[PDB]
Design a protein around this ligand. Sequence first.
Ligand SMILES: [Mg+2]
Ligand SMILES: [Mg+2]
Ligand SMILES: [Mg+2]
Ligand SMILES: [Mg+2]
Ligand SMILES: [Mg+2]
Ligand SMILES: [Mg+2]
Ligand SMILES: [Mg+2]
Ligand SMILES: [Mg+2]
Ligand SMILES: [Mg+2]
Ligand SMILES: [Mg+2]
Ligand SMILES: [Mg+2]
Ligand SMILES: [Mg+2]
Ligand SMILES: [Mg+2]
Ligand SMILES: [Mg+2]
Ligand SMILES: [Mg+2]
Ligand SMILES: [Mg+2]
Ligand SMILES: [Mg+2]
Ligand SMILES: [Mg+2]
Ligand SMILES: [Mg+2]
Ligand SMILES: [Mg+2]
Ligand SMILES: [Mg+2]
Ligand SMILES: [Mg+2]
Ligand SMILES: [Mg+2]
Ligand SMILES: [Mg+2]
Ligand SMILES: [Mg+2]
Ligand SMILES: [Mg+2]
Ligand SMILES: [Mg+2]
Ligand SMILES: [Mg+2]
Ligand SMILES: [Mg+2]
Ligand SMILES: [Mg+2]
Ligand SMILES: [Mg+2]
Ligand SMILES: [Mg+2]
Ligand SMILES: [Mg+2]
Ligand SMILES: [Mg+2]
Ligand SMILES: [Mg+2]
Ligand SMILES: [Mg+2]
Ligand SMILES: [Mg+2]
Ligand SMILES: [Mg+2]
Ligand SMILES: [Zn+2]
Ligand SMILES: [Zn+2]
Ligand SMILES: [Zn+2]
Lengths: 25, 81, 96, 153, 214, 91, 98, 127
Amino acid sequence: MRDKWRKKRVRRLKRKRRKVRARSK
Amino acid sequence: VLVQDLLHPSPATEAKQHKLKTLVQQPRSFFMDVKCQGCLNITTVFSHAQTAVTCDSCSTVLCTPTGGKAKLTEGCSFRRK
Amino acid sequence: NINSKLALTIKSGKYTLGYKSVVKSLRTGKAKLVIIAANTPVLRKSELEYYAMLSKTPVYYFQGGNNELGTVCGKLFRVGTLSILDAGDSDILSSI
Amino acid sequence: PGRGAPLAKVAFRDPYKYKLREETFIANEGVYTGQFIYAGKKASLNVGNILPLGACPEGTIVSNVEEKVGDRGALGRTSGNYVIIIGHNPDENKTRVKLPSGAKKIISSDARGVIGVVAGGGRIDKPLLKAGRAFHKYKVKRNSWPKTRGVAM
Amino acid sequence: VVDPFTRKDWFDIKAPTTFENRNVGKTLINRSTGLKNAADGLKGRVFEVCLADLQGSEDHSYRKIKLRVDEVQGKNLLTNFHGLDFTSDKLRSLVRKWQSLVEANVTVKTSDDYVLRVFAIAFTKRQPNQIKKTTYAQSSKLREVRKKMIEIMQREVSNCTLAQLTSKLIPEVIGREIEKSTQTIFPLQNVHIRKVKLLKQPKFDLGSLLALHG
Amino acid sequence: TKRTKKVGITGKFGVRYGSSLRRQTKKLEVQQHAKYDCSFCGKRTVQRGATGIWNCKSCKKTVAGGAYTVSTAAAATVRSTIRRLRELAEA
Amino acid sequence: PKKRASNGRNKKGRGHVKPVRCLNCARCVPKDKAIKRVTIRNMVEAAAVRDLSEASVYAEYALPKLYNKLHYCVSCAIHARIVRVRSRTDRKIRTPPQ
Amino acid sequence: SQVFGVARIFASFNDTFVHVTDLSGKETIARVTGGMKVKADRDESSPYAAMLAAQDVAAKCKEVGITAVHIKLRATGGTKTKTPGPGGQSALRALARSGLRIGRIEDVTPVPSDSTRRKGGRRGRRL
RNA sequence: CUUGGAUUUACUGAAGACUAACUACUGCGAAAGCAUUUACCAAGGACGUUUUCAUUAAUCAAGAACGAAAGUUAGGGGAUCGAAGAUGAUCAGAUACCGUCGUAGUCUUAACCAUAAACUAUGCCGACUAGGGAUCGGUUGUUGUUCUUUUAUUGACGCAAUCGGCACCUUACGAGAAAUCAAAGUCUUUGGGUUCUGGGGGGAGUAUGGUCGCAAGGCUGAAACUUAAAGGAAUUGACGGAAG
Ligand SMILES: [Mg+2]
Ligand SMILES: [Mg+2]
Ligand SMILES: [Mg+2]
Ligand SMILES: [Mg+2]
Ligand SMILES: [Mg+2]
Ligand SMILES: [Mg+2]
Ligand SMILES: [Mg+2]
Ligand SMILES: [Mg+2]
Ligand SMILES: [Mg+2]
Ligand SMILES: [Mg+2]
Ligand SMILES: [Mg+2]
Ligand SMILES: [Mg+2]
Ligand SMILES: [Mg+2]
Ligand SMILES: [Mg+2]
Ligand SMILES: [Mg+2]
Ligand SMILES: [Mg+2]
Ligand SMILES: [Mg+2]
Ligand SMILES: [Mg+2]
Ligand SMILES: [Mg+2]
Ligand SMILES: [Mg+2]
Ligand SMILES: [Mg+2]
Ligand SMILES: [Mg+2]
Ligand SMILES: [Mg+2]
Ligand SMILES: [Mg+2]
Ligand SMILES: [Mg+2]
Ligand SMILES: [Mg+2]
Ligand SMILES: [Mg+2]
Ligand SMILES: [Mg+2]
Ligand SMILES: [Mg+2]
Ligand SMILES: [Mg+2]
Ligand SMILES: [Mg+2]
Ligand SMILES: [Mg+2]
Ligand SMILES: [Mg+2]
Ligand SMILES: [Mg+2]
Ligand SMILES: [Mg+2]
Ligand SMILES: [Mg+2]
Ligand SMILES: [Mg+2]
Ligand SMILES: [Mg+2]
Ligand SMILES: [Zn+2]
Ligand SMILES: [Zn+2]
Ligand SMILES: [Zn+2]
């Protein structure tokens, strides 16, 4: 896939990890 | 040119070189004796003068500074010292 | 430009700084020039130039305030007015 | 109290009898104590002066403008607000102005106004932060605070 | 259904005496009725006619004059000067590459209080012996020429009435003086007053206008 | 020492009201408690009374200003605009 | 690899050049990179230059020209044959076609 | 001599306007468009439709008394193309060949001084 | 959208943007960037200099200033384009390309962000090695040239030198895998000074910790595991809804 969209996919997926981890803050 | 006399360059081509690019660097400027038309008083003036030089007798400007050589006013004759 | 001429007078000549000194110097005729800051009160200003008119002293109106007039004179304080008693190496008197 | 704009007390002489008249003007920003205020048709374009609308060129910033000739000020009286003069119609003796709400109004050119912006502007930029601050704000205005929601009654 | 052209009345357009061929042409308007007169709804019209037509000569083919009607006398329309402009093609033919274009404008009022904006344009001239491809003037010279343009337009307009100026515009008096005045700054070519706009007119004086019509 | 890292004067409000309201308050409340330079005597002795009121301790001149600064940008713009428009009218 | 020493534009000793819109597709293209052609065409086609001169009320009236400067992006120009693909050695030639 | 109108011809790439006014331009004498002569949108700007449009304009001009016109051709201008449409060339030739007399000719396209932003986006219209 | 007069036409007015043509293998700036006039404010390179000081210097972890666009916060503005969104088409399907509307945004004032193929994919200082014609800035000698004004002390142009720039053309002593390079040369005949970075391809700029940020995100940054290639330049062919 396009390198720019692969980075966007990971950025959106990094966003999910942060929100999920925040549950157990 | 593989062989060339670097120690004795032709004085014609030596004079076309930049002032810092001669064998021994030498200024191309000089000092002048300026006769204003109004009176007769020796005043030594640098060729590339940056000052509006005035003669002692009458407060009249002899030269105006420029980018390079100073420009002598009308009626002023110079002789290189 | 006038600032450079005034700075030389402070370095070499004689002067008084302040309203009380300037009025005394106008009374004795020892003043050569009176310099008034831009933000000087008009009542004090119109009185200072009445003393100078009587004393026959030219007055120069500085363009900056008393904060800027002090630092031109090399001072760390405010100068609302000053009088030049002796213009020394400078030629401020010849340029008004 | 109750006003965001400070008020200025300006003393004039009475033209007809030996007496001082103290007027209460809305202070424009830059007006100082001891300043001379000039009011009339022939007054000059200086901050704090009161001029007829026809004597001010387009783009003149003016405050405490009269809605009607001689009502002594109706428009642009709160802190930070002003009126911009848009243009003139000298044949009908009328002037177009822009009000703080953004509305364009046509006023008689003989109506007067005070040059400048009303002082105290920028007041709304700060949060009140407390119910008590609003209590004290309306303590010298009127009984309009606090408001119960009609849906909760 | 009605053929609205049966109710139209034709009027003749007369140019001021500053031009030669004063018979500009014809216009029409709804015929004067009881409610609305034809006269009042007819004044204020602007006609754009080529200056070559107003003078016969084709040397003025690149200038077009706006004429404003401001008095009606029967079937004759008494027009006045409303503006000046160049044709679009003439300007496009003057703006070449490898040269500098310099423009200036100034707002100035005439003797009779006609407020105008006058636009001047000029180009650098290539010398007959010039070898280099381009003809560029240094920005300092262009500032002096631009300054020279403004003070000439200001001088030659405020000292005369609008009618004399109209007689000045036709032979490029101002353009010839700018070229002469800037000779010591930089050689110039195609010095033209490329546009004149009327901004403000004085209070209407029918007697002054009537003198401009014979 | 430095007592607070960032709250500064709004440390009097503790943890209440929200950080955005406290940092917005801090900006405007430093300005309203500052000392400004007097245009009359030249000293930096001008302080606010109520909103729009700015007094000088030295020469006792009071000037009408903004709610939280002696002069707002809008007034400075109007001051130069009026100065400019005054020149044309008076030639 | 690098195809052209000029990078397909005319930017040397410069950081940024403001863009222009292609006449054909309105694509933003830098001013130095755009393929520019200056055209001075007769406003009336040669078939009609006679009858329009006869219909003219002016004896010996010269018809004005139509002056236009056209700006194209790379895709529009190649498609419209404004520029063509040249051989590797012929690309370097930048004199106007004879 | 002749009685002049002004033929304001607006020739875009989707239509062709043949509009004759008086000298002032405030009075319209005849306005026939290429779209009044055809029922297909694709050839509203065709040269054939412009010639028919010009002929109807010339016929209307004759019965009102207009014997000659000045030509002010224009394109769409603005942010769009400055070249005139295909119908502008036909309407001019048709007017000259219809017995009408021709005066001055000028291009009056609205040409900006670098103005507002043009439809299509940064990447243009992709086809 | 239109007989409720659309579109078009002339005249007039109001808003915001933006500075066409002149505009170039031209200029300036550390870079990002900078294009209407004039005024004001403070800078800058080059050139000229028989002025002055005398090693004050070169490159630089840490740390600072600036940093397109987009984006964030709060006011103001909101003409035009226009993410999102809504819509008409096309299609097998089309949330898209195309068309019509359109909100944030686009502009501005105070703060944030600190990223771009932020490119010359090419660090900076110093020396040398090769010819040529153009061009910008400065200086110095000189015309069958035009012009102030009639000429000079006008300005332009022309011919030579030179220093500095933006570039370009030819050659290859020399380099390179080649494409190509006046530097990418003076490198097995290997050392002028100095900063930063890479060590097969992925996993991966991922996880985690730290730090900056209001957020979006920025900086620093692994490992497990997997694989015999991945990749660069060029040649021939094949193919192309590319050109001749
Ligand atoms: Mg969940
Ligand atoms: Mg003091
Ligand atoms: Mg009331
Ligand atoms: Mg209550
Ligand atoms: Mg409630
Ligand atoms: Mg409520
Ligand atoms: Mg209840
Ligand atoms: Mg001169
Ligand atoms: Mg303590
Ligand atoms: Mg390729
Ligand atoms: Mg540079
Ligand atoms: Mg860049
Ligand atoms: Mg760039
Ligand atoms: Mg190109
Ligand atoms: Mg159509
Ligand atoms: Mg149609
Ligand atoms: Mg139809
Ligand atoms: Mg395509
Ligand atoms: Mg330039
Ligand atoms: Mg421009
Ligand atoms: Mg930005
Ligand atoms: Mg941005
Ligand atoms: Mg933004
Ligand atoms: Mg906003
Ligand atoms: Mg749109
Ligand atoms: Mg959509
Ligand atoms: Mg839907
Ligand atoms: Mg659908
Ligand atoms: Mg990066
Ligand atoms: Mg690049
Ligand atoms: Mg040179
Ligand atoms: Mg000699
Ligand atoms: Mg001169
Ligand atoms: Mg000169
Ligand atoms: Mg590796
Ligand atoms: Mg993982
Ligand atoms: Mg945080
Ligand atoms: Mg390959
Ligand atoms: Zn002497
Ligand atoms: Zn004070
Ligand atoms: Zn395109």
